[PDB]
Ligand code: HEM
Ligand code: HEM
């Protein structure tokens with residue numbers, strides 16, 4: 001289930017992080033406007049940019065911690081508050097997060113691994129509600 | 138064949154029991170709610186818990202006894218009745234058992250071992266029928 005999925009992702013995190021974030025950017029190409037120098041590039045081109053791998057891994061490092069600190073897929077209020085207050089997130093709204101989780105869930109349902117995709121959908125929804133509660137537009 | 142599979146499983150009952158049970162919960166995550174003490178725990182966390190290894194083994198011990206007592210993958214009526222009237226199975230339906238055997242067969246097919254998967258599928262089918270006859274919804 002959800003807890004084991006965290007361990008699964010953490011066991012091969014860079015690969016899962018890149019593949020999920022790529023799924024997100026390919027599903028929602030206009031989301032590249034938040035990220036400098038990602039436009040006009042194929043997956044393989046992105047994966048060879050030093051910053052892409054480093055940054056995507058850090059995002060998923062933190063996502064796994066938030067998920068791991070959750071109870072029944074409900075994140076901590078302080079984790080939501082940190083995500084809202086991060087300067088790197090100043091121009092984001094809940095819809096950015098919703099779209100990332102739609103892509104994440106769709107990646108999980110399509111993959112060879114027995115992810116508990118329904119729990120990640122719940123977690124995504126609960127995170128969006130928490131971000132809203134913490135003051136994200 | 139089926140008889141050898143019973144010997145194989147019995148030979149390392151702890152491991153196979155835990156492996157197949159987890160394959161079951163992974164394929165059908167909603168089933169975890171029947172085991173409230175296993176909720177929100179990783180696979181390694183679960184294996185450190187006394188009752189997880191002990192109770193899952195006891196489940197598969199009885200499964201093997203039922204399997205061994207069967208003729209041509211047809212279990213005894215008395216064994217089916219034991220399963221229906223166990224207090225722990227009061228809120229269960231044949232669908233719970235179907236799912237366990239679907240996962241068990243999938244596990245067998247995906248393992249590198251020459252399990253008689255078709256026989257376990259048939260055993261599962263015959264047991265589900267027997268449970269129904271014994272009054273399980
Ligand atoms: C649970 C979901 C998310 C987590 C845990 C998270 C976490 C992080 C972390 C840890 C960083 C720092 C990375 C670094 O400096 O190397 C970062 C940066 C950033 N994030 Fe988020 N993030 C999430 C969702 C999103 C979403 C949905 C977007 C927009 C679609 C976004 C946009 C950005 C941007 C623009 C930066 C700075 C530029 C960059 O790293 O390329 N984040 N995020
Ligand atoms: C042929 C298949 C099955 C056999 C032989 C079997 C046998 C057993 C046995 C021997 C126990 C007692 C374990 C102990 O406490 O020492 C048990 C308990 C229990 N079983 Fe079943 N079972 C089967 C299928 C299922 C299924 C499909 C479910 C639900 C999805 C289920 C749910 C439970 C629950 C909730 C308990 C009590 C929890 C616990 O033991 O900690 N069983 N079963």
Ligand SMILES: Oc1ccc(Cl)cc1
Pocket residue numbers: 021055056059100
């Ligand atoms: O640098 C990155 C990489 C992935 C995400 Cl979701 C956000 C920022």
Ligand SMILES: Oc1ccc(Cl)cc1
Pocket residue numbers: 158172188189192193196
């Ligand atoms: O504790 C347990 C473990 C597995 C099963 Cl089927 C029932 C109870």
